[PDB]
Design a protein around this ligand. Structure first.
Ligand SMILES: [Ca+2]
Ligand SMILES: [Ca+2]
Ligand SMILES: [Ca+2]
Ligand SMILES: [Cl-]
Ligand SMILES: [Cl-]
Ligand SMILES: [Zn+2]
Lengths: 107, 106, 114
């Protein structure tokens, strides 16, 4: 379970959420995303492979992954309330923040 | 994410929890609190604007927010078991922790 | 005592999961585990009592606790889907990682000079 694997899991579950039809499928997908976001914050992306883990740059990376976890959790709260369309809209929005982090640290 | 709005979200959802009649209302509110607590730990509160992000003081702030997330999650477990009164009581203790954190870092 | 207490909570709920008969029992236990894993990442284990909290070694400990939280959350996703046997199997795998972390960071005082 490396960083790219966690990012792939985020991508795959975003596509599941977009096609889902009920709250339970959305919530399951968001829980898998939350697990991947937490895992990604413990992993080292390509751009940081030889950086000091206590560097400001590495801390910023980990905080960015926590930002994703916060957005995923808020979308989970919406879906738990039965606001499924709202949770799907929230997932579509956080896709862009996930993409920002993916593009910043990949390769 | 910004720290002040996360604190407001925590405060708002504590009041939702106090008024709640069933476990699902409590769980949803706790999930909004958990998202806010996670978000708050990625921000720099006013008291830390003059400190390095890698400082001991900034780490203590982020660990404090993680402590809050841990308490929220435990209250969520209680509410998931249908222990609404116990979850509301855990949330009352949560309020003290949130208040203290707000006063320390505002 | 905070770190040891959280490790005890993890172990206690792994047994709950092993004995569970439905998804809701597993989910509640995993949520208690997730709370304990998050709490443990704010604690200082015996092996780190003399180290700077901003040290690389303290950070590696906190990341190891986050690794547990990620595994617990994945098991929660399985149980939320109703895949109870699968979540219980994930929890058994989790026990191995919990034990590894416990052995790494617990006090080794009883083994000194053996
Ligand atoms: Ca892959
Ligand atoms: Ca791989
Ligand atoms: Ca406002
Ligand atoms: Cl976290
Ligand atoms: Cl037992
Ligand atoms: Zn964290």
């Amino acid at each position: 379970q490396d960083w790219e694997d966690a990012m792939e899991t985020l991508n795959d579950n975003l596509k599941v959420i977009e096609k889902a039809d009920n709250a339970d499928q959305v919530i399951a997908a968001l829980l898998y995303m939350l697990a991947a976001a937490i895992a990604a914050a413990t992993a080292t992306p390509p751009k940081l492979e030889d950086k000091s883990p206590t560097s400001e740059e590495a801390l910023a990376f980990r905080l960015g992954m926590h930002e994703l976890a916060a957005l995923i959790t808020k979308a989970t709260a919406l879906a738990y309330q039965g606001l499924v369309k709202e949770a799907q809209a929230a997932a579509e929005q956080l896709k862009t923040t996930v993409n920002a982090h993916w593009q910043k640290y990949r390769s």
